[PDB]
Amino acid sequence: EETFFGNFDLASLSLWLFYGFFALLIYYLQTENMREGYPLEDEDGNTAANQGPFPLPKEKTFKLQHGRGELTLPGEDVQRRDNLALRKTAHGNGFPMEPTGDPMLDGVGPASWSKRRDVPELDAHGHPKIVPMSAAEGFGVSAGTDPRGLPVMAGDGEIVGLVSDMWIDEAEQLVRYLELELDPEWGDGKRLVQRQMVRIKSDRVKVRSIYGKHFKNVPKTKSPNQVTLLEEDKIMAYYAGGTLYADESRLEPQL
Amino acid sequence: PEYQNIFTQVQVQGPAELGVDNENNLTEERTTGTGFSQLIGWIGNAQLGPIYLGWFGIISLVTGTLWFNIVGFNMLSQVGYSIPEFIRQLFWLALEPPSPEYGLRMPPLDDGGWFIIASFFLLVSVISWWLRTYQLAEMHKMGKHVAWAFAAAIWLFLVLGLFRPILMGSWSEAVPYGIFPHLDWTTAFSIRYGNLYYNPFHALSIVFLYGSVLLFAMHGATILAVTRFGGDRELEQIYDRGTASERAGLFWRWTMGFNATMEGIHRWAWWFAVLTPITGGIGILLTGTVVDNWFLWAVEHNFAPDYTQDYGYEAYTTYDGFLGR
Amino acid sequence: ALLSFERKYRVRGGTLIGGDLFDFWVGPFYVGFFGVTTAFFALLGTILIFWGASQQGTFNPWLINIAPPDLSYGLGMAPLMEGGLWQIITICAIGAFVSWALREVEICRKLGMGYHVPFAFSVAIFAYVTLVVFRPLLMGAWGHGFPYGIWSHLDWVSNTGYAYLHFHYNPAHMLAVTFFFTTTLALALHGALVLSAANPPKGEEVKGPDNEDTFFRDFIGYSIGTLGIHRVGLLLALNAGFWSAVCIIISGPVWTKGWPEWWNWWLEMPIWP
Amino acid sequence: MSKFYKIWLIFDPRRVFVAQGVFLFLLAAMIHLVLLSTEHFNWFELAAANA
Amino acid sequence: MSKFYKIWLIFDPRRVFVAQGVFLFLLAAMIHLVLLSTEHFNWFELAAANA
Amino acid sequence: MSKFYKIWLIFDPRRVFVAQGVFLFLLAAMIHLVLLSTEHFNWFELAAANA
Amino acid sequence: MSKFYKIWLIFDPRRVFVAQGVFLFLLAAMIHLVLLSTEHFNWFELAAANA
Amino acid sequence: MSKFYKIWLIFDPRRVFVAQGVFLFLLAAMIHLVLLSTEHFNWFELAAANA
Amino acid sequence: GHVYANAEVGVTCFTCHRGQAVPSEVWYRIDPVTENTSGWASVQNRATSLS
Amino acid sequence: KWFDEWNSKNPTDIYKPAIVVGVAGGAVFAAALLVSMGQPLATDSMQTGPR
Amino acid sequence: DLSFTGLTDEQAQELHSVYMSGLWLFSAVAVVAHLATFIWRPWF
Amino acid sequence: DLSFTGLTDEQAQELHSVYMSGLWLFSAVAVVAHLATFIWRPWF
Amino acid sequence: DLSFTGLTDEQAQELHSVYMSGLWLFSAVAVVAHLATFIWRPWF
Amino acid sequence: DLSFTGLTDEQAQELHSVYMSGLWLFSAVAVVAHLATFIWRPWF
């Protein structure tokens, strides 16, 4: 086989064509991932002077189900929090912020939640997706240890109440939440725990993230039969913030 | 320690799901009958079945079983119909492609005719499974990403078995049907044409394979760390951004200076995986037809290293000194 | 510059060591104690690589080669030009990788997340330390490590496999290749399914998890689910890296002959006639 | 030349000091190793040869 | 030179002392090992050779 | 110096004691093994030789 | 010297005793096995080589 | 101290007894095997030699 | 050129014979190694005594 | 005998320090065994080309 | 699993006493075994 | 005065004596063992 | 004045006194061991 | 006055005095060690 010029043959032409195509593909891939969080801002909420080397993408529209409307991106930030109890620790950019009051109650840091829609997520038939087991026709524990009726122990070693029910996702057949009834000494009413934050044993159920005295301030659902996305985010973030804010020794260097 | 989410603590079972439907009436061709496996349910879903039976799937199954039995029966007859020897040498037997002297003409059944008949039945089977993957998206009213990703691998399949033998002018250029015999083909192909390390498209294919495995370790680990915020429900996170997506993005932004979105990471994954067989097939198609010695090509294009020291064991030691005498 | 939702997460605390002495950001990057150790080690390693390139005589990125010492030096230290620079760069690289993992740990602690990512990165660190520290120590000389060169570390791979005649017949290499191919097929399927659910034909509504579960039971009669697929992908990738480390550490210190001969135990089993 | 102090109105000392502390020690270690990798300026080998 | 105490107005001593101790011990270990890596300054070999 | 005791107002006596204990034991074990790795300073073989 | 009884005013004795026991066994095992490795202190090989 | 029964109030008998049993059996088996690995104390070879 | 490549190393009867009448490691033709096969298909796909 | 303490100052993970000791000083045990007695299955290699 | 949630004072004296009764029995047996072994094949 | 455990001055002082006695008995046993071993086969 | 531990000044002075008393004994024992080792087998 | 740490001028002065006093002792010990080593086996 011959060359076009010098040492240039068909393999070289193919290689350079792939180089050009890959450069265009990298541009497309990086531009496609900029539909959330832009334009950039500084630490005072103003638009930043630098916006980077890539321009922003054009708009796409999503047609949602069950008559929820349309979504156009990139657009305005509708999940933005309004009044955050935070304080700057420096005059410029690049330094951390300090909570003004109680970080766990104010939803800041690892306890932060995003302002999602105030409606439950639906399944294919238009029904709420997560339902307590006491109202779910045909479901039963088929494997593992059933946690209903067991006491719950906090991270500091206190018994705070008993498991009363389980909330399940019927479409995917999975347990999502555990429902806890509190003793009068540790609060009143019922609270929820996400399944990924518990360890179920033979005689107890352990939640290590928070202590007993923190169990009365867990956010509460409005209806006893359904939970919206906003409540889900606030409940999950509350438990997640305890990994750092439960004790002062969890925040300081471990060395 | 905290729960890690690799195994489910407690399982729940309800009525079996039969699937969604629309005006295309997918129920008419679905089998009735389901099962449940509690061993699998420790990791994923426990329900087994049902499955859809169209004509594409039935044709694919029938023609693929035919290919398997022509190969298996040829292997059995090569050994004298001895079942214990058939079991003893299973990994070593194969159905061999034709001899180079026959070109692209039809060879004797003893010397590659059964290989060509069986290759035609495997071809038909594979193209039918792809038409099924396209039809089901069309019937489900979804995108065609799965079919395109499958066609990406079918491209290298066809290059290895159909296109390159035709451009080279011999059916003898095809791959044998065997476990060990097909690995011997790989080594012999690499040796015959210089060194396949110095084929640039082979290097690009390795780049994309390494990148695809690094990305499932990163994506799987990242999604498992945000499951305490509902991060495994990805579609609703796309339609309504939550704190799981924000934390997942900020982890990588603070780690390496840039990040992705919930929807956009799957495009990255789709492209790296798809790019491996495309570059591999382009590299294979250029061998023998254009370039015959890849190491001499590298020497010509000046990316072959040079070494100063000498060759030989007696340039470094002595035979008596290596034995302890 | 910050994203539209990033300011509320930038709080103080969650460090393993250093307190607020290194608790800040440079651009998008977070620095801590392990960000200062990573910078030092990586910069020293790169500068030494380029000094070695200058002394070799070529600056071509394809042709730069820094190599381990001769086998006659054993486990001692060689002169810096005859293989000692390789040893120093190896130490620097180990330090940089460990500092990177411990920095990821602090970022995870600050964000309140799980520690899955550093644990997954530890597997890749283990495959590299097996290639440059564990096999060489067992075999008795640092000269068994691979060289630092873009096209010269492929010559090492080629010569090391033909030193056992037919490397494809290594039993643990066959397991590792299968894991690699399965991870790529599963990543392709997962990406395709999610994109096809989120991007329907023009004029149609988007789909949910029910639709995804249904398509896959119709296609193959089973669906792992939205949570199972990530567990399976992680497990496949980690199994791929662990079996790779095994395939290399048995090739030298455990087996000396060709790998086909290892299969003789199956061919001469007493049950066979 | 007399207005150089205004550099501290731009950069916070906390970041600059740690950057300089990393940079200086990195430079010193490198020059000692570039010196240790020559024949003429390796002071460990000179003591062995001059002995 | 007489105002170098103000370094404690910028950096917290608690987090500086630990880093200084780690740095000092690592540097001492590295220097001792580098000396042990030679022929002229290896004091374990010298005692065997001399006696 | 007379004012060194103030080190116990910056540091906490419990992690100092835990850290010291681990460091000292590891250093002692390392030195003993390094002595065991030599030819001149291995006390098990010298008894055999002089015997 | 006579005021060492405050170590348990700082340390958890119950958490220390178990660690002490485990440490002490590992040490004893290590020593016997090391002694079993030498030609002059293997007490089983002595009796064979002493009639 | 005169009665050391006050050590079981900081323990759980169940796991202590299980660990004790496992440790005792493992140590006895290892001593028996170590004796079996010795020329002079292998009682199975001695019967063959006294034959 | 082959038998005296590096030194004087000849051959006698005790090089292929080692006390035997038929020397070890001799070979014969065994080519059609499978049945029902004709070209390159008749020589390879089997584990034999010559492969 | 004033032990209303054990029960009142109850939470103590009495086992973790021991596990840490048995893990840390357990690596010193295998290191000591590889230094005293050597490598079980050692092997040597002959160089045939460049480094 | 802790349901006993701590032993008492008088639920430990009896335990110590029974435990000590087995330890002394096992040790007497081991002493006789070692004496017989030394009489058979001495090592000192 | 100060504590991180809960004990007091005199009470910890009394608790130290049991540890001291046990340590001295252990050390005495080990010393007799080493003294017998040295006479049996010396290492210096 | 300055405090980060909550411990006072007199407590620090007592703690340092006991700590230095405990350190000098360790130093003296190590010095005696090193001198005995040098007399047995010199390294300089 | 400027303070990112929380200390006053007097506290910083008092801290620096003791820190420098410790540093000089460390340096003096190192100097004596280096002089002895140079006499034993000179470099340069």
Ligand code: BCL
């Ligand atoms: C001596 C050995 C040679 C060598 C010779 C070759 C040869 C020859 C080839 C590879 C190829 C590849 N090499 Mg190489 N390679 C070497 C060393 C390496 C090393 C290394 C040392 O670490 C690595 C990482 C690789 C890796 C790779 C991959 C990157 C690449 C395969 C692409 C792919 O998509 O695979 C995945 C495989 C496929 C997509 C195959 C398609 C499968 C089809 C679609 C299956 C259909 C369905 C089926 C019939 C039904 C089954 C039954 C069902 C159960 C119903 N090589 C050395 C230099 N290499 C290939 C390539 O592309 O070269 C550029 C190739 O042909």
Ligand SMILES: CC[C@H]1c2cc3[nH]c4c(c3C)C(=O)[C@H](C(=O)OC)c4c3nc(cc4[nH]c(cc(n2)[C@@H]1C)c(C(C)=O)c4C)[C@@H](C)[C@@H]3CCC(=O)OC/C=C(/C)CCC[C@H](C)CCC[C@H](C)CCCC(C)C
């Ligand atoms: C790369 C992915 C591979 C794959 C995976 C896969 N397929 C599967 C499964 C899995 C993991 C099943 O569990 C499921 C099955 O039940 O198989 C027996 C199945 C299946 N894939 C099938 C088809 C199929 N898959 C294909 C492809 C693939 N699927 C790939 C090889 C193809 C081709 C040619 O491409 C085909 C044609 C069927 C064999 C089967 C469809 C399921 C079905 O019809 O179930 C009916 C229900 C039953 C009553 C049968 C269950 C058996 C027991 C009596 C139930 C009790 C469970 C018991 C406790 C455990 C046993 C189950 C075991 C599978 C663990």
Ligand SMILES: CC[C@H]1c2cc3[nH]c4c(c3C)C(=O)[C@H](C(=O)OC)c4c3nc(cc4[nH]c(cc(n2)[C@@H]1C)c(C(C)=O)c4C)[C@@H](C)[C@@H]3CCC(=O)OC/C=C(\C)CCC[C@H](C)CCC[C@H](C)CCCC(C)C
């Ligand atoms: C992008 C490149 C990657 C990739 C992707 C990829 N592969 C794919 C797809 C995609 C996107 C599919 O959609 C398709 C699929 O169906 O996936 C589930 C597939 C697929 N890739 C496959 C294989 C495969 N892919 C490979 C590679 C790769 N595919 C790359 C890593 C490899 C290798 C060598 O690494 C292999 C071996 C199949 C599982 C499947 C294609 C199915 C097909 O065409 O089947 C034809 C069927 C027959 C042969 C007839 C059946 C006869 C059988 C011999 C027996 C009966 C069937 C039974 C279920 C099996 C036996 C089990 C018993 C217990 C019953």
Ligand SMILES: CC[C@H]1c2cc3[nH]c4c(c3C)C(=O)[C@H](C(=O)OC)c4c3nc(cc4[nH]c(cc(n2)[C@@H]1C)c(C(C)=O)c4C)[C@@H](C)[C@@H]3CCC(=O)OC/C=C(\C)CCC[C@H](C)CCC[C@H](C)CCCC(C)C
């Ligand atoms: C299951 C194991 C898989 C895996 C996992 C893995 N790797 C990871 C992660 C995970 C989960 C991360 O989180 C982490 C990350 O941040 O990714 C973006 C990472 C990462 N793995 C990377 C790459 C990588 N991973 C690879 C593979 C894999 N990693 C496996 C397939 C490969 C190859 C060869 O296949 C490469 C090249 C990095 C991009 C990244 C983070 C490493 C990093 O940045 O470390 C800090 C160091 C520097 C910035 C520079 C160090 C400079 C040195 C001092 C000098 C260089 C010397 C070097 C040895 C020369 C080599 C020359 C070659 C030509 C031979």
Ligand SMILES: CCCCCCCC/C=C\CCCCCCCC(=O)O[C@H](COC(=O)CCCCCCCCCCCCCCCCC)COP(=O)(O)OC[C@@H](O)CO
């Ligand atoms: C030659 C140059 C590199 C130096 C040489 C040595 C290293 C070589 C190896 C890898 C290079 C990776 C370097 C990436 C570092 C990025 C640093 C960063 O962070 O850069 C961002 C800008 O980057 C990005 O946005 C991502 C860039 C792509 C990432 C790498 C892709 C690897 C793809 C494939 C694998 C590559 C193998 C080759 C295939 C050969 C193929 C023929 C600034 O921030 P940003 O906010 O994101 O700005 C953007 C926007 O937002 C505007 O607003």
Ligand code: HEM
């Ligand atoms: C294709 C043919 C053969 C191969 C591959 C082969 C290979 C070799 C090689 C490479 C050496 C040199 C070894 C070294 O330098 O260390 C050697 C030497 C030798 N071979 Fe063979 N050999 C072959 C056949 C034979 C046969 C059949 C005989 C004897 C009748 C034989 C007798 C010898 C002798 C005597 C030596 C030693 C000579 C020396 O190194 O001084 N070889 N062979």
Ligand SMILES: COC(C)(C)C(=O)C/C=C(\C)CC/C=C(\C)CC/C=C(\C)CCCC/C(C)=C/CCC(C)CC/C=C(\C)CCC=C(C)C
């Ligand atoms: C051979 O060629 C190769 C490539 C090998 C090279 O080696 C090339 C090398 C180079 C190109 C090297 C280049 C080097 C430089 C550019 C070096 C620059 C160096 C400096 C600018 C050094 C500056 C050092 C400054 C110092 C030490 C300043 C201050 C120290 C203090 C302790 C000050 C204390 C301050 C206080 C207390 C402030 C408190 C005040 C208050 C008001 C609170």
Ligand SMILES: COC(C)(C)C(=O)C/C=C(\C)CC/C=C(\C)CC/C=C(\C)CCCC/C(C)=C/CCC(C)CC/C=C(\C)CCC=C(C)C
């Ligand atoms: C963890 O935090 C806390 C606060 C608890 C601590 O830090 C606590 C720490 C401890 C409680 C530490 C305790 C340490 C020990 C108990 C250490 C004990 C050490 C020894 C008993 C060492 C003995 C060493 C003996 C040696 C080396 C003997 C050598 C002998 C020879 C070499 C023989 C030759 C001798 C001749 C020729 C005689 C000439 C010698 C003369 C000195 C005259």
Ligand SMILES: COC(C)(C)C(=O)C/C=C(\C)CC/C=C(\C)CC/C=C(\C)CCCC/C(C)=C/CCC(C)CC/C=C(\C)CCC=C(C)C
């Ligand atoms: C040769 O090259 C290589 C690298 C191999 C080397 O070997 C290099 C080695 C080095 C570089 C080694 C370096 C070693 C050091 C820097 C060592 C330093 C050691 C010390 C500073 C040791 C200090 C020890 C102190 C001790 C043991 C103190 C003990 C005290 C007590 C037991 C008293 C306890 C106090 C109490 C209870 C206070 C009372 C409480 C109240 C509340 C009042």
Ligand SMILES: COC(C)(C)C(=O)C/C=C(\C)CC/C=C(\C)CC/C=C(\C)CCCC/C(C)=C/CCC(C)CC/C=C(\C)CCC=C(C)C
């Ligand atoms: C040869 O080439 C190679 C690369 C191999 C090298 O070896 C290169 C080596 C180098 C480039 C080495 C460089 C080394 C340095 C720059 C070293 C620097 C070292 C120091 C600055 C050390 C400082 C030490 C200071 C000390 C020890 C100070 C104080 C100690 C105290 C114990 C004081 C305690 C303080 C108290 C109690 C204050 C409390 C007071 C109150 C009021 C609360």
Ligand SMILES: COC(C)(C)C(=O)C/C=C(\C)CC/C=C(\C)CC/C=C(\C)CCCC/C(C)=C/CC[C@H](C)CC/C=C(/C)CCC=C(C)C
């Ligand atoms: C040759 O080189 C190598 C490395 C191989 C070596 O061999 C090196 C070896 C070393 C460096 C070894 C070093 C060893 C040491 C430093 C060992 C030190 C050991 C001790 C200080 C041990 C002390 C033990 C004391 C005991 C057991 C005393 C009493 C205990 C009790 C009475 C238990 C009950 C206690 C109380 C108070 C009642 C219970 C109360 C509660 C609140 C639970």
Ligand SMILES: COC(C)(C)C(=O)C/C=C(\C)CC/C=C(\C)CC/C=C(\C)CCCC/C(C)=C\CCC(C)CC/C=C(\C)CCC=C(C)C
């Ligand atoms: C006898 O026992 C029973 C009945 C149980 C059996 O049936 C047993 C069966 C077996 C034991 C079977 C074993 C089978 C194997 C071990 C099979 C192995 C197969 C492979 C590794 C196959 C690889 C195939 C192909 C490769 C690597 C690449 C490309 C191929 C193709 C594109 C093929 C397509 C061919 C075409 C298009 C040519 C057709 C010709 C025309 C003229 C149209």
Ligand SMILES: [Fe+3]
């Ligand atoms: Fe995903």
